[PDB]
C-alpha cells in the first residue's frame, strides 16, 4: 500500500490540460452569464420604479401597481419552473450537491433557460431571494453543457467541470473568488468519500468568471461598511455568546424553512395553478412591502450598510428581523427559484447589530461599536443553518474587508456551529437533498 | 443511494470528546509556539549583547558573530542526529506521513528535540522559518494528548494530529485561516477519504491563535501598510510574473533536493562530520547576519523594506542569489527548520524586482513595485510546495491588502500551471516519497 502512496505522491497535481482549458471556458461563460442575469434583474426592478413614478399621484392605485408588477413577475416566474423544470425551484444548490454525487440529473437543455428567466422574474419582482442560488445552478449546467458538448469523458472531467461551474457561479454572484473555491471544497463536494476534483482546475474557472464580473461591475462594491474598529481580547467572550445565540436559533430557522415547505405545499396541493397563483400572491406581497417598507422586502444587501453603521433604532431592528424571517420563508419555502443564502446574510447582520447595541450599553468600558458585532454575525446564520463556517467567514471577510475582526468572526461563527450541533440542527442544504433524494425512493 | 440519505442527515456530528481535546491540543501548541518564539528571540538577542561587548576589534567581532551561531547550530544538529533524525528538515513531511499512517510520531523524543533543536538553529540566525518546528511540535502535541487520554478510533487520531498541525502553523504566522486551509489543502491524505473533523480543527486553531495574541499583541509580523489597487489592463503583468515563478519553481526544487544529496557526502552519515558541517553553516549565517543581514536571517525583516521599494534594482538581485544560496545550504543540510517562510522572503524579493522593471516599461499603468512584491510573496509556496489556496490566504492574512487578491491569484495560479507543465512537483510531497521510499529499501 505504501509502495502505492510513493507512486501517487510523485504523481500528484497533474491534471489533464484538456480539463484545465475547459474549466477556463466554463468560467468565462458562467461569468458572462451571471453578469447578464444580474443586469436583467436590475433592469426589471428598475422598470417597476418607472411605473410607480407613473402613478405617484393616486396612492391606492400606486400600492396596486407595486403589487401587480411583482405579482405578474413572480407568476411568470413560478410558471416556467413548474411547467418546465421542477428542480429550478428552491435554492438550486442542493440539486448540484446531488449531481456531484451522481444522484441527481443535470437537465441543462431545460434548467439553463428556465432557472435564468425564472429568476429574473422572482428577483426582478423584488422578492426576498439571493442570486447565488440561480447562478450556482446556472453555473453547474454551464460546466455540464461544455462537458457534453465537447464530449469530454471520465469522472474527473465530469465532477470537475461540474464543480467549477458551481464555484465560479458563486464567486461572480458575490464578487469573491476565494469564497467560491472554499464553498465547493467544504460543502458542494461529495462529503463522505474520495472524489476526482482538480482544485487547480477550479481556480482557473473562478478567476475567469470573477474577471468577467469585474469587466462589467467595477467601481462599486456590493456591501461597503468601510473600516470598523478593533476588538480587544477582553471582548471576545461576547462574540462567543453571540455565537451561542445564533447557534440555538439556527436549527429552529431550519425547522421553519422546511415545515413551511410542506404547509405551503397544501395550499396548492401540487396543482400547477394553485401554485403559480400562490406565487403571484407572495410575489406581489413583496413588490408591495418594497414600497411601504423596503427593509422587509428585497434581496437584503441595501440594508446591511445602514444596520452596521447603527442608523437603525433598537426597535426598527427587531421589527425588520421578524418581518424578514417571515418574508424569507414565505419566499424560499414557496419553492421559487432563488438562493436563501444572501437573505441569511442580511439576517445575521440585523441580529448582529441588535446584539451589538445591547452590548454597547451594558459594557461602556469596552468601547464597543454595534458594527463589529454586526459583521461578526453577518455570516453566523450561514454557520448555524447551512453549517459551512469556513465558507461563511471567508465570504464575509471578502465583502466587508475588515480582517481585524477575523478572530471574533470565527469565535462567533464557531460557537454557532457548536450550538447548532448540540441542539439537533442539520446542514439545511444537505437536509434538503435528503428530503428530495428520499422522496424518490419513498415514491416506489 | 439509500446510504447517502443516511449519511447526509448524520453529517457534521463529531464526538464532543474529540472537540474538547482539539481545544486542549490548541491551547498547548499555542503556549508552546509562543515559548519557542520567545526563546529564539532571546538567543538572537544574547548574541547582539555579545557584539556590543567587542565592538572595538573588528576581526574579533566577526569571529564572535560566527562562533556563537556556529556553537548554537552544532548543539542544534547534534540533538537531532543523536535523538531524532526526523526533527531534521522542515518537519512538515513527517506529519503528512503520520496522517497517512506511514510515519511514526515519536513525541516522547521529537518534542524536546525539535524544540531545543530549533532554538539552536533559529537563535543562531540561520535561514529557516518557524512553521516547520512548530507544525511538527504541533502534531506531536496533538498525538501526546491522544495517547495520554487514550482516545481511540481513526477520527480521534487523525483529527488531533491534524489540528495539532494546523494550530501549529497558525500561531507561527498569526493567521488562523491559513492554518485550516493548509491541512485541508496539503497536510491531509491527498488521495483517499479521511476521518478528519474540520470543525474540531477550528477550535484548536482559535485556541492557539488566542494564546499567541495573549503574548504577542500590539505588533504584526509583516507590515506593508496599504498599497494601491490594480487596474484590469494591468492583470496580464501578474500572469507573466506567475509564468516566471512557474518555471523557476521546479528548478528551485531540483536544487533543494540535489543539495541534500551533495551535502550528505560531506559527512557521509557520520554524526560528527554532520554536526560540524552544521556549525560551519551555522556560523556562516551568524556572520552574514552582521556583514549583510539581508542575506542571512529568517527573512521577515526585509519584506517591508523591499515592498516599499527601498532597495536598488541591484541590491535586490544580489540578495536574491545570496539567499537562494543561504537557503539551500540551510535546508538541504538537514537542520530543523521550515523552508516555508524563507520562500516567502524570496518571492517578495523576486516580486519587487519584477515590479521595478514593470514600473518603467509601463509608465501609463502607474504601477507600484510593492503590488508585484505582494503578488509574488506567496508565488514560491505556489510553484514549490504547490499549494496556492493556502499561500494566497496566508499572505492576504499578513499583508492585509485584499484589493490585490485578483492579481495575487493570477500570479499564484500562473505559477502552479507553469510548474506542472515544466515537470516540477509538490516539494513537500516529493520529500515524503524520498523518505518513504528509502524506508522500504
Amino acid at each position: 500500500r505504501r509502495r502505492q502512496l510513493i507512486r501517487q505522491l510523485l504523481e500528484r497535481d497533474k491534471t489533464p490540460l484538456a480539463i484545465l482549458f475547459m474549466a477556463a471556458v466554463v468560467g468565462t461563460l458562467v461569468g458572462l452569464a451571471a453578469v447578464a442575469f444580474d443586469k436583467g434583474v436590475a433592469w426589471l426592478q428598475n422598470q417597476r420604479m418607472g411605473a410607480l413614478v407613473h402613478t405617484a399621484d393616486n396612492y391606492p392605485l400606486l400600492l396596486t401597481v407595486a403589487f401587480l408588477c411583482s405579482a405578474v413577475l413572480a407568476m411568470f416566474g413560478y410558471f416556467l419552473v413548474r411547467k418546465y423544470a421542477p428542480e429550478a425551484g428552491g435554492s438550486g444548490i442542493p440539486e448540484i450537491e446531488g449531481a456531484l454525487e451522481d444522484q441527481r440529473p443535470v437537465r441543462w437543455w431545460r434548467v439553463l433557460p428556465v432557472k435564468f428567466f425564472g429568476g429574473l422574474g422572482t428577483l426582478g419582482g423584488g422578492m426576498v431571494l439571493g442570486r447565488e442560488g440561480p447562478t450556482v445552478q446556472i453555473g453547474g449546467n454551464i460546466g455540464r453543457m461544455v462537458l457534453d458538448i465537447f464530449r469530454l469523458k471520465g469522472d474527473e472531467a465530469r465532477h470537475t467541470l461540474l464543480a467549477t461551474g458551481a464555484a465560479a457561479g458563486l464567486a461572480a454572484a458575490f464578487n469573491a473568488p476565494l469564497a467560491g473555491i472554499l464553498f465547493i471544497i467544504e460543502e458542494m463536494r461529495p462529503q463522505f468519500r474520495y472524489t476526482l476534483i482538480s482544485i487547480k482546475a477550479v481556480f482557473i474557472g473562478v478567476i475567469m468568471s470573477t474577471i468577467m464580473y469585474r469587466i462589467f461591475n467595477h467601481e462599486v462594491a456590493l456591501i461597503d461598511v468601510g473600516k470598523l474598529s478593533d476588538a480587544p481580547l477582553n471582548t471576545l467572550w461576547l462574540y462567543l455568546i453571540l455565537g451561542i445565540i445564533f447557534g440555538i436559533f439556527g436549527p429552529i430557522f431550519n425547522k421553519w424553512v422546511l415545515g413551511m415547505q410542506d404547509l405551503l405545499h397544501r395550499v396548492h396541493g401540487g396543482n400547477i395553478t394553485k401554485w403559480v397563483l400562490m406565487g403571484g400572491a407572495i410575489g406581489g406581497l413583496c413588490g408591495l412591502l418594497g414600497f411601504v417598507a423596503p427593509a422587509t422586502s428585497g434581496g437584503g444587501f441595501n440594508l446591511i450598510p445602514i444596520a452596521t453603521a447603527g442608523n437603525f433604532s433598537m426597535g426598527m431592528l427587531v421589527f425588520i428581523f421578524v418581518a424578514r424571517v417571515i418574508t424569507t420563508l414565505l419566499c424560499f419555502s414557496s419553492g421559487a427559484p432563488g438562493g436563501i443564502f444572501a437573505p441569511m446574510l442580511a439576517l445575521g447582520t440585523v441580529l448582529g447589530t441588535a446584539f451589538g447595541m445591547v452590548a454597547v450599553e451594558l459594557f461602556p468600558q469596552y468601547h464597543l461599536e454595534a458594527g463589529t458585532f454586526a459583521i461578526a454575525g453577518m455570516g453566523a446564520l450561514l454557520a448555524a443553518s447551512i453549517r459551512a463556517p469556513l465558507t461563511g467567514i471567508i465570504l464575509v471577510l471578502e465583502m466587508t474587508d475588515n480582517y481585524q475582526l477575523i478572530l471574533p468572526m470565527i469565535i462567533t461563527g464557531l460557537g454557532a456551529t457548536l450550538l447548532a450541533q448540540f441542539t439537533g440542527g442539520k446542514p439545511l442544504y444537505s437536509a434538503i437533498l435528503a428530503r428530495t433524494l428520499a422522496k424518490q425512493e419513498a415514491e416506489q | 443511494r439509500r446510504q447517502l440519505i443516511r449519511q447526509l442527515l448524520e453529517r457534521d456530528k463529531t464526538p464532543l470528546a474529540i472537540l474538547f481535546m482539539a481545544a486542549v491540543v490548541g491551547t498547548l501548541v499555542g503556549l508552546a509556539a509562543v515559548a519557542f518564539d520567545k526563546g529564539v528571540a532571546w538567543l538572537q538577542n544574547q548574541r547582539m549583547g555579545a557584539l556590543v561587548h567587542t565592538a572595538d576589534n573588528y576581526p574579533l567581532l566577526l569571529t564572535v558573530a560566527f562562533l556563537c551561531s556556529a556553537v548554537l547550530a552544532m548543539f542544534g544538529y547534534f540533538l537531532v542526529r543523536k535523538y531524532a533524525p526526523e526533527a531534521g528538515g522542515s518537519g512538515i513531511p513527517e506529519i503528512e506521513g503520520a496522517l497517512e499512517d506511514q510515519r511514526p510520531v515519536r513525541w516522547w523524543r521529537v518534542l524536546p528535540v525539535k524544540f531545543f533543536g530549533g532554538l539552536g538553529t533559529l537563535g543562531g540566525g540561520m535561514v529557516l522559518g518557524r512553521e516547520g518546528p512548530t507544525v511538527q511540535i504541533g502534531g506531536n502535541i496533538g498525538r501526546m494528548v491522544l495517547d495520554i487520554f487514550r482516545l481511540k478510533g481513526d477520527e480521534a487520531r487523525h483529527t488531533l494530529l491534524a489540528t495539532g498541525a494546523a494550530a501549529g502553523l497558525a500561531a507561527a504566522f498569526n493567521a488562523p485561516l491559513a492554518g485550516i486551509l493548509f491541512i485541508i489543502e496539503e497536510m491531509r491524505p491527498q488521495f483517499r477519504y479521511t476521518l478528519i473533523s474540520i470543525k474540531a480543527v477550528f477550535i484548536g486553531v482559535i485556541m492557539s491563535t488566542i494564546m499567541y495574541r495573549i503574548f504577542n499583541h500590539e505588533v504584526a509580523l509583516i507590515d506593508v501598510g496599504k498599497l494601491s489597487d490594480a487596474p484590469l489592463n494591468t492583470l496580464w503583468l501578474y500572469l507573466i510574473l506567475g509564468i516566471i515563478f512557474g518555471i523557476f519553481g521546479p528548478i528551485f526544487n531540483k536544487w533543494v533536493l540535489g543539495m541534500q544529496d551533495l551535502l550528505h557526502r560531506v559527512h557521509g552519515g557520520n554524526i560528527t562530520k554532520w554536526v560540524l558541517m552544521g556549525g560551519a553553516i551555522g556560523g556562516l549565517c551568524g556572520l552574514l547576519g552582521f556583514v549583510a543581514p539581508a542575506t542571512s536571517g529568517g527573512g521577515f525583516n526585509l519584506i517591508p523594506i523591499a515592498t516599499a521599494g527601498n532597495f536598488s534594482m541591484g541590491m535586490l538581485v544580489f540578495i536574491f542569489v545570496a539567499r537562494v544560496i543561504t537557503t539551500l545550504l540551510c535546508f538541504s543540510s538537514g537542520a530543523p527548520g521550515g523552508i516555508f517562510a524563507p520562500m516567502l522572503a524570496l518571492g517578495t524579493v523576486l516580486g519587487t524586482a519584477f515590479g521595478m522593471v514593470a514600473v518603467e516599461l509601463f509608465p501609463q499603468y502607474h504601477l507600484e513595485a510593492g503590488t508585484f512584491a505582494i503578488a509574488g510573496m506567496g508565488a514560491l509556496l505556489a510553484a514549490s510546495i504547490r499549494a496556492p489556496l493556502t499561500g494566497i490566504i496566508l499572505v492576504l492574512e499578513m499583508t492585509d491588502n485584499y484589493q490585490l487578491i485578483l492579481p495575487m491569484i493570477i500570479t499564484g495560479l500562473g505559477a502552479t500551471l507553469l510548474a506542472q507543465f515544466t515537470g516540477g512537483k509538490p516539494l513537500y510531497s516529493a520529500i515524503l516519497a524520498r523518505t518513504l521510499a528509502k524506508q522500504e529499501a
Partner: antibody
Amino acid sequence: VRLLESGGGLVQPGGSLKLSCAASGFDYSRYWMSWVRQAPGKGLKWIGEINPVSSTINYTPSLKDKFIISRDNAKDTLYLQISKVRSEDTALYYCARLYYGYGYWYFDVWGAGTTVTVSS
Amino acid sequence: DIVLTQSPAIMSAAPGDKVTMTCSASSSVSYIHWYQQKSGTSPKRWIYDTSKLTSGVPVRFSGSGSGTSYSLTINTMEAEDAATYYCQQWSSHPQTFGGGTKLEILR
C-alpha cells in the same frame, strides 16, 4: 505625537470656555480621546471621552450640560466646553488619547494641559 | 466608581533601596494602571495592565496585585524615581484614580 491643548484662562463665576486640544503625529481617527482634570493639591478626575465618529460621548456624573465634548476629525482637534462655572472648576485640564493592552483602557498619551481659573 | 485608595500618602527612601506603594480598590478591580507625575509635567503612563512596563520604564519597576489590592515596586529605586504615582482602573466604568503616593528621596 503631540497633544497640545490651549484655551484655558481666567473666567468669572457663571461663565463659559471652549478648551482646545490639537493633535500632531498620528492618525486622529481610529482613536478615542478624552479630557481629565486635576484641581490643585487635589487629584485627577476623568471628565469625559469621545470616539472617532463622535457617535459616543460619556461624562463623569455631572449635571445636564456642565460639559459638552466634541471633536472635529478634520482639524485633528478635540474640544471641551464648560458652562456655568464655579470654583470647583478651577483646575488644570489635560487631554489624552485612549488605548489598551488586554482591553482595560488607560490614558495612553497626555498633553501639557491648559489652566482654568474661576474667579471674580 | 470604584474608590481607589493609594497607601503611603507620602514616603521617603534612600537610593538603591526597595520600595512598594499600595492601591486598595473598594470593590473589585482588574489590571490597575500606573502613572508617574513629576512636579510640572503631565502624568506619564508607567505600568499598565497590573504588571506590564510601558515601553521605556526602567525594569526597576514591577507592577502587581489582584482583585482588591494591588501594588507597585522599585527594586532599588534611584533618585530619578522621585515623583508621585497614581493608580488607575477602568475595569468598571467609570475610570477612577487613586489618592496618589508621593515618593521623596531620603537624604
